[PDB]
CSV table of C-alpha atoms and ligand atoms in Angstrom, one decimal:
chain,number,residue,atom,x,y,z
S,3,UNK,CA,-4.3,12.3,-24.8
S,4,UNK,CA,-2.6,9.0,-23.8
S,5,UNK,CA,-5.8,7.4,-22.1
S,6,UNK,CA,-4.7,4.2,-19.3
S,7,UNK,CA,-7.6,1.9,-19.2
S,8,UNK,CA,-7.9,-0.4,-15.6
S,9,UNK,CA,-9.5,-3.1,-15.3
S,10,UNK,CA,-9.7,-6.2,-13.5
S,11,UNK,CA,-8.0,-10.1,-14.4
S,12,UNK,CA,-11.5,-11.8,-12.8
S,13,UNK,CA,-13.4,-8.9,-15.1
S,14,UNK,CA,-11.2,-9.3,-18.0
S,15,UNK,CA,-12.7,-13.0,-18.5
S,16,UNK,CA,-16.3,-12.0,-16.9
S,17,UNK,CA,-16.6,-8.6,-18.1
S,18,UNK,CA,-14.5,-9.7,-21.4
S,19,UNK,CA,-16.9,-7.8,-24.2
S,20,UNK,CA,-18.0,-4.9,-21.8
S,21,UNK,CA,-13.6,-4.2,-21.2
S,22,UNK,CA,-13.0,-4.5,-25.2
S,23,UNK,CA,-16.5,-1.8,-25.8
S,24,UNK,CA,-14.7,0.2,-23.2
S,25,UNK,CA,-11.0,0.0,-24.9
S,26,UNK,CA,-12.3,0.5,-28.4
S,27,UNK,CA,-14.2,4.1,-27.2
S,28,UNK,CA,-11.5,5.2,-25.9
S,29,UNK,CA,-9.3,4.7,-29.0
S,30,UNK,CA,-11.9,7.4,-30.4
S,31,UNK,CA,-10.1,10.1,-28.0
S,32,UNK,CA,-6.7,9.4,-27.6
S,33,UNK,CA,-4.0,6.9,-27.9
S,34,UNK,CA,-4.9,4.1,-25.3
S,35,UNK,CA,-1.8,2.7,-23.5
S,36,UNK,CA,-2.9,-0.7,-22.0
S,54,UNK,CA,7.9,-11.5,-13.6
S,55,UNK,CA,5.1,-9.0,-11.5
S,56,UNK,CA,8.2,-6.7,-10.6
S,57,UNK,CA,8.1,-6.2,-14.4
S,58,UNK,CA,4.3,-5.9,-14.3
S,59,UNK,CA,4.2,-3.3,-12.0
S,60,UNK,CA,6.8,-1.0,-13.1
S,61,UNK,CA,5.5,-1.1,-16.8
S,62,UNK,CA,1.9,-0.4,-15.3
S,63,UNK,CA,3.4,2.6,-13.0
S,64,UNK,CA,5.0,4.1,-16.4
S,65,UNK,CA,2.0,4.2,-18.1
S,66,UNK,CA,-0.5,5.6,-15.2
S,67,UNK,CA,2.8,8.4,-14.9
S,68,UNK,CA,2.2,9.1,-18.5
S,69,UNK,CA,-1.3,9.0,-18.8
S,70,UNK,CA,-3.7,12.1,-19.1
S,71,UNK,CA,-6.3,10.1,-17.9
S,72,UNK,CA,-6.8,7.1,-16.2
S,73,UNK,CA,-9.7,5.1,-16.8
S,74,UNK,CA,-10.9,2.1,-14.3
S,75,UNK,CA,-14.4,-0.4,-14.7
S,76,UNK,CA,-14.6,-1.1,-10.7
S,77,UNK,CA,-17.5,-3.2,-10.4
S,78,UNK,CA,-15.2,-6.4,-10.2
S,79,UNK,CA,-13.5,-6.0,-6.6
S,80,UNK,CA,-9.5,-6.0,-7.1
S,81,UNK,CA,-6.5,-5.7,-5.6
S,82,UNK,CA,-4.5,-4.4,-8.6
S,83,UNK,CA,-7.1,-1.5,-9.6
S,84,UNK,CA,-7.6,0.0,-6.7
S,85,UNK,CA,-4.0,0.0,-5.9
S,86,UNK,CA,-3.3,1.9,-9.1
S,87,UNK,CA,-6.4,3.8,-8.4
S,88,UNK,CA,-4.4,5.1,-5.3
S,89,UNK,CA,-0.9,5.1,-7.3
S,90,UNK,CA,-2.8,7.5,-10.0
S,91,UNK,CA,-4.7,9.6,-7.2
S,92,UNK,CA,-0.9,10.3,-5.5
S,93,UNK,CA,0.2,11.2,-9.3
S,94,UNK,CA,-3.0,14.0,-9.4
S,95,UNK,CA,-4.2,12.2,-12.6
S,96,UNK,CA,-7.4,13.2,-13.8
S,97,UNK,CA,-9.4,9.8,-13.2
S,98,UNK,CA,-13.2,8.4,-14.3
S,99,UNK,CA,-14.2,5.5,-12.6
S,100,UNK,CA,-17.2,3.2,-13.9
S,101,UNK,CA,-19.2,1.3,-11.4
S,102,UNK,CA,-22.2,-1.1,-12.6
S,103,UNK,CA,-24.9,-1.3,-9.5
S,104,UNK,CA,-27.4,-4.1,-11.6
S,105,UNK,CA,-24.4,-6.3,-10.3
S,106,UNK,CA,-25.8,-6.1,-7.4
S,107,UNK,CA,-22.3,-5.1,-5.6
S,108,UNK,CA,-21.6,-2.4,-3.0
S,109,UNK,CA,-18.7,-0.1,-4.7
S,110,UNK,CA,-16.1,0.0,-1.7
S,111,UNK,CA,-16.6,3.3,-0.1
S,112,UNK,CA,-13.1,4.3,-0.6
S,113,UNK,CA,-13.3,4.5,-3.9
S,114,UNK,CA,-16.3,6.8,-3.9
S,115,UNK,CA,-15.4,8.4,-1.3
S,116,UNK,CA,-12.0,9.2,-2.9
S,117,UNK,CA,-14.5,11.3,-5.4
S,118,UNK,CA,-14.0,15.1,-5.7
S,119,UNK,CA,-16.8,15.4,-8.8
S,120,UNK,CA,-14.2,16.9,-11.2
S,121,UNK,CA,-10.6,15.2,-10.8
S,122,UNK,CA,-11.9,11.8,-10.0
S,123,UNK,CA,-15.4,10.7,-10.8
S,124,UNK,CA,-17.9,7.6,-10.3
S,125,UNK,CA,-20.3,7.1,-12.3
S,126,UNK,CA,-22.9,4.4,-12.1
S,127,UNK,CA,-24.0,2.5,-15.6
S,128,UNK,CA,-25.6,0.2,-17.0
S,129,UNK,CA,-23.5,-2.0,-19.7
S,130,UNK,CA,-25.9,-1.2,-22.4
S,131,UNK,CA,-24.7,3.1,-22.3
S,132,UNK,CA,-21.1,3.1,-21.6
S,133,UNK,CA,-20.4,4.2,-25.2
S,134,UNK,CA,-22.8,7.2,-24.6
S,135,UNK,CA,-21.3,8.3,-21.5
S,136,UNK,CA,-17.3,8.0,-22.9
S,137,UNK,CA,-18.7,10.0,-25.5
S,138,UNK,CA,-19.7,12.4,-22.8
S,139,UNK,CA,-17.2,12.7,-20.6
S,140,UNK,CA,-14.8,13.2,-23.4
S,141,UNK,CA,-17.0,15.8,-25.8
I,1,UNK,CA,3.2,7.8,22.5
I,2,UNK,CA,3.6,3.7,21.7
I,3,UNK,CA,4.0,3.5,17.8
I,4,UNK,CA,0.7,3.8,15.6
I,5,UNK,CA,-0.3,0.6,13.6
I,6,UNK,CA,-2.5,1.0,10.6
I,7,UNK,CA,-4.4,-2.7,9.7
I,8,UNK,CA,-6.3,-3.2,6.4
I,9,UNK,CA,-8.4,-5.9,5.0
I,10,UNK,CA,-11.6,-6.5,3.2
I,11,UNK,CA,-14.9,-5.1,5.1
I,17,UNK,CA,-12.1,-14.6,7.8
I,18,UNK,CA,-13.5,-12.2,10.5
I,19,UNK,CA,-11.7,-14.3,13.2
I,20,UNK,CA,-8.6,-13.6,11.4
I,21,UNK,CA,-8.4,-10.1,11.0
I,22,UNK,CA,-9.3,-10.0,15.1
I,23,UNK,CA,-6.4,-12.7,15.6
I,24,UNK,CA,-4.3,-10.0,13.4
I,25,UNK,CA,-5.2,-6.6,15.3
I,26,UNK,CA,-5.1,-8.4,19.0
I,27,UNK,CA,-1.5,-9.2,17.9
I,28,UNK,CA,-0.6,-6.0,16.4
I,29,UNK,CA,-1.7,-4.2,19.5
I,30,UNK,CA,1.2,-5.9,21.2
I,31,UNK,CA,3.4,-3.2,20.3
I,32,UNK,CA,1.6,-0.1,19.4
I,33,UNK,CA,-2.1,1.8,19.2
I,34,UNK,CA,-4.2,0.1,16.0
I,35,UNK,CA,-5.1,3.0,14.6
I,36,UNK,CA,-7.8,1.4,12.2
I,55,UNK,CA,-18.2,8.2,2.0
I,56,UNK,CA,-16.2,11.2,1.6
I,57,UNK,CA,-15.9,11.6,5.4
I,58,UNK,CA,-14.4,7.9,5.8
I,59,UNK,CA,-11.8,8.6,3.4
I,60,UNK,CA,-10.5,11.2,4.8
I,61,UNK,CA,-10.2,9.7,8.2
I,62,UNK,CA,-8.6,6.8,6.3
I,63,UNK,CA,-6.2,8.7,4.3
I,64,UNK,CA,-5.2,10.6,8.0
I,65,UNK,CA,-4.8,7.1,9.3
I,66,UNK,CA,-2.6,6.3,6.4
I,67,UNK,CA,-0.3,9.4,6.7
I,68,UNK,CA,0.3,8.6,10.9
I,69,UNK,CA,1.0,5.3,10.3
I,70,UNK,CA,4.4,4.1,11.2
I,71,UNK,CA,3.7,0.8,9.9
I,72,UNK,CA,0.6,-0.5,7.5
I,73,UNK,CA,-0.1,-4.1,7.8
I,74,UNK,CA,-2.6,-5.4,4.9
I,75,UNK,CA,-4.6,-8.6,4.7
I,76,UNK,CA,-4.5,-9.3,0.7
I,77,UNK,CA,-6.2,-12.7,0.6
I,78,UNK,CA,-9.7,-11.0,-0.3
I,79,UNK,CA,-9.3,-8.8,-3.4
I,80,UNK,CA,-10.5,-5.9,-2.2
I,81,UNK,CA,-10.5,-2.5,-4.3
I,82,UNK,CA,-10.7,-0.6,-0.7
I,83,UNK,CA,-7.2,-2.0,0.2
I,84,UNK,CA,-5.7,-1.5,-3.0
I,85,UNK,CA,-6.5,1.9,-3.1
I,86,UNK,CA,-4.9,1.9,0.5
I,87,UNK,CA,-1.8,0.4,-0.1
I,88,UNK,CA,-1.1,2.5,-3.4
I,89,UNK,CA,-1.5,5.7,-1.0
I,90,UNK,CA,0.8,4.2,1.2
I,91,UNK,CA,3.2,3.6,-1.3
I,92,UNK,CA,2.8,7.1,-2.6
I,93,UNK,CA,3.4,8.1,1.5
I,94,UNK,CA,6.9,6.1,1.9
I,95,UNK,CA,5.2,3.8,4.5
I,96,UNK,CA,6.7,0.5,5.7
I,97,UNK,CA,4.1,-1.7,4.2
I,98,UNK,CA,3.8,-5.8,5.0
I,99,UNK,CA,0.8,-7.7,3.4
I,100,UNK,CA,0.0,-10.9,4.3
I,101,UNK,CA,-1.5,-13.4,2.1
I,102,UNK,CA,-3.2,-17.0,2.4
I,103,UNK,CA,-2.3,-19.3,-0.6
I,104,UNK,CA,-4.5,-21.5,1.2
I,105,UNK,CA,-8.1,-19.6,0.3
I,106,UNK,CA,-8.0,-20.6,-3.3
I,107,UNK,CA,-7.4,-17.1,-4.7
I,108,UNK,CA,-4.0,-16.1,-7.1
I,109,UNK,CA,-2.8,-12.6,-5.6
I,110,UNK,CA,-2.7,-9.9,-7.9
I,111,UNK,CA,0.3,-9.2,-9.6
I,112,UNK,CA,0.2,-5.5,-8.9
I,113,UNK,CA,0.5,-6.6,-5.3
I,114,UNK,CA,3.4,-8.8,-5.0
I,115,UNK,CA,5.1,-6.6,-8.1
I,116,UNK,CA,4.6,-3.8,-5.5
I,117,UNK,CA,7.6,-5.8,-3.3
I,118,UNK,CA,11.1,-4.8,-2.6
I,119,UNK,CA,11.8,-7.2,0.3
I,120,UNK,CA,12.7,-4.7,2.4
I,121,UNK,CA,10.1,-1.3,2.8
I,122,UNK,CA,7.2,-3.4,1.0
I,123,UNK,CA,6.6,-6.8,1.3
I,124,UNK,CA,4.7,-9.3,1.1
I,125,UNK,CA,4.4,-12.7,2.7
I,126,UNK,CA,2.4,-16.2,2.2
I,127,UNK,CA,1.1,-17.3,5.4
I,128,UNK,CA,-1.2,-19.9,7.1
I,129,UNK,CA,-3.8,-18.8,9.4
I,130,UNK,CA,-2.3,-20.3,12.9
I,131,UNK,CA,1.0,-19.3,12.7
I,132,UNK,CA,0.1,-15.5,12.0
I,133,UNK,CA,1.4,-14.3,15.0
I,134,UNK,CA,4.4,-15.8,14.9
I,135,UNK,CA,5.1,-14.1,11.6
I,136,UNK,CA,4.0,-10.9,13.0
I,137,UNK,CA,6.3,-11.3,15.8
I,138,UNK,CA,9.2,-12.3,13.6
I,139,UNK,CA,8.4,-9.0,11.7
I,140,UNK,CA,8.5,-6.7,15.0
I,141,UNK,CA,11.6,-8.7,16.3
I,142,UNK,CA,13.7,-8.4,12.9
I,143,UNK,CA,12.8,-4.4,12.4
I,144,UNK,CA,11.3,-2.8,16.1
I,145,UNK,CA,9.1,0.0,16.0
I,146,UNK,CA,10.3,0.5,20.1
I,147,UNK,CA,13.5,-1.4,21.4
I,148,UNK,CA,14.0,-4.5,23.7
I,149,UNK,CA,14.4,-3.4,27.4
I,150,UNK,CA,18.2,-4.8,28.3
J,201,LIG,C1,2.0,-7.5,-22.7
J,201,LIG,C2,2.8,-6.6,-21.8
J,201,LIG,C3,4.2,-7.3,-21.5
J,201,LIG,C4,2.1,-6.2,-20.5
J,201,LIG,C5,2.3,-5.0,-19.9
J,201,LIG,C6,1.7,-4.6,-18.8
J,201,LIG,C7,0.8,-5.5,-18.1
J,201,LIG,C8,0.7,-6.8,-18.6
J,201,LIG,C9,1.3,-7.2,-19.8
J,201,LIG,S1,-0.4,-8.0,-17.8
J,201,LIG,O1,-1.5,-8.3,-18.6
J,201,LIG,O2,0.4,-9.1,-17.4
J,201,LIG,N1,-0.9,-7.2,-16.5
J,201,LIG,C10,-0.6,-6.0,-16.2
J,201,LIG,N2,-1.2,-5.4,-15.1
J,201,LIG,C11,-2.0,-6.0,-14.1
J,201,LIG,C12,-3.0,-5.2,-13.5
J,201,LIG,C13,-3.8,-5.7,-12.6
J,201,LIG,CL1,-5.1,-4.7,-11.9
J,201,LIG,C14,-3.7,-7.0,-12.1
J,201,LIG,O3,-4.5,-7.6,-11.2
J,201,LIG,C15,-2.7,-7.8,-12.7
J,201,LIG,CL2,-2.5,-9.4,-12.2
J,201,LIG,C16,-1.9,-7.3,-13.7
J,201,LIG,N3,0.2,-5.1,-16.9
J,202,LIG,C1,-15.5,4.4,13.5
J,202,LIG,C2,-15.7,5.4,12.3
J,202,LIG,C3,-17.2,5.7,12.1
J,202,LIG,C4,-15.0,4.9,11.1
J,202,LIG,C5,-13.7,5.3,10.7
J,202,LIG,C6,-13.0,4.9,9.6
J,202,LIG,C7,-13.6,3.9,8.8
J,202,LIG,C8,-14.9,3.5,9.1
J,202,LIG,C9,-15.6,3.9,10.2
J,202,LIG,S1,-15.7,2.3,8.1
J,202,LIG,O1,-15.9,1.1,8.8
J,202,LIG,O2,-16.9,2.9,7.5
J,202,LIG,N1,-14.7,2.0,6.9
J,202,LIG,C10,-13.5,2.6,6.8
J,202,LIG,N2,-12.7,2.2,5.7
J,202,LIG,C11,-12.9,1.3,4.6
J,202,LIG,C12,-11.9,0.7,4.1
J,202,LIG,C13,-12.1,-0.2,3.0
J,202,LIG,CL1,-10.7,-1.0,2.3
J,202,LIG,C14,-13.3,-0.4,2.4
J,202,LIG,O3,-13.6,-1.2,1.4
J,202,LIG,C15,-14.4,0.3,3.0
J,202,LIG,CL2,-16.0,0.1,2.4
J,202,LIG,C16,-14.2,1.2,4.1
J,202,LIG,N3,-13.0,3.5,7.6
């Protein structure tokens, strides 16, 4: 299972340890794939070949949900991981973009995401 | 029926007002689980998407992406001017012609917008 991990830049310096505890979980399961022209179409190659696609949206970003909505036009089978102690209101698009099977949000807390990739993959 | 217009930004307030008033100049402005799905219609009737980028939003990512997906002449307009660096997925998302993306400053908006229209009309000049 190639397994495309999203995240944001802002949550990549903020949510630094949290990303790399997400990246090395998913190694457990499958092979994990992760000018801007160059950017985009390398990120567009992997979301294409991904089996899953994997995205931490508590940070608001451009860039994730827009491969959030490339990845929902390429029926990927997506998880999304939202944490509410942030104290941030997840954009209702991306919720509402939830059908409970083929794209999910799930609500942690930083402290069980092992646990729950662990679940959703066993 | 006059063209449909479909404007995104983040849920600057005076901007986005400045942005539709103008857009309505030449068509209708069209713009949990129930709002995306009106969103999504939105998307599909669109004959043009217009974006305000300079708040990262994952709301209008996830928009534009769909649009992408949906062919749809796309134009985002971003202000270099609020501090932020726009995402790389965004402006790697151009092709200067059905997607782009342009740097603006907030009082000469609808001059850009009209430059858009006048360069590529959705409804032709009257002779
Ligand atoms: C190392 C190789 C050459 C490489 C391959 C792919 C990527 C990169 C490097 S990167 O670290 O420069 N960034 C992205 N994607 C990206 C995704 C989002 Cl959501 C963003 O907001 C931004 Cl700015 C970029 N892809
Ligand atoms: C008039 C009716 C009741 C109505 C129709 C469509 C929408 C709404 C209300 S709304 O004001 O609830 N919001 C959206 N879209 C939306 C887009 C982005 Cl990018 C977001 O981040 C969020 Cl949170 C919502 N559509």
């Amino acid at each position: 299972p190639a397994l495309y991990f999203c995240g944001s830049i802002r949550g990549g310096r903020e949510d630094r340890t949290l990303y790399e505890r997400i990246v090395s979980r998913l190694r457990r399961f499958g092979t994990v794939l992760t000018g801007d022209r160059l950017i985009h179409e390398q990120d567009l190659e992997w979301l294409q070949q991904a089996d899953v696609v994997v995205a931490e949206v508590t940070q608001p970003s451009l860039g994730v949900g827009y491969e959030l909505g490339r990845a929902v036009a390429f029926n990927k089978r997506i998880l999304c991981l939202f944490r509410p102690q942030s104290g941030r209101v997840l954009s209702a698009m991306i919720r509402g973009a939830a059908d409970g099977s083929r794209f999910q949000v799930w609500d942690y807390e930083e402290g069980e995401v092992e646990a729950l990739l662990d679940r959703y993959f066993e």
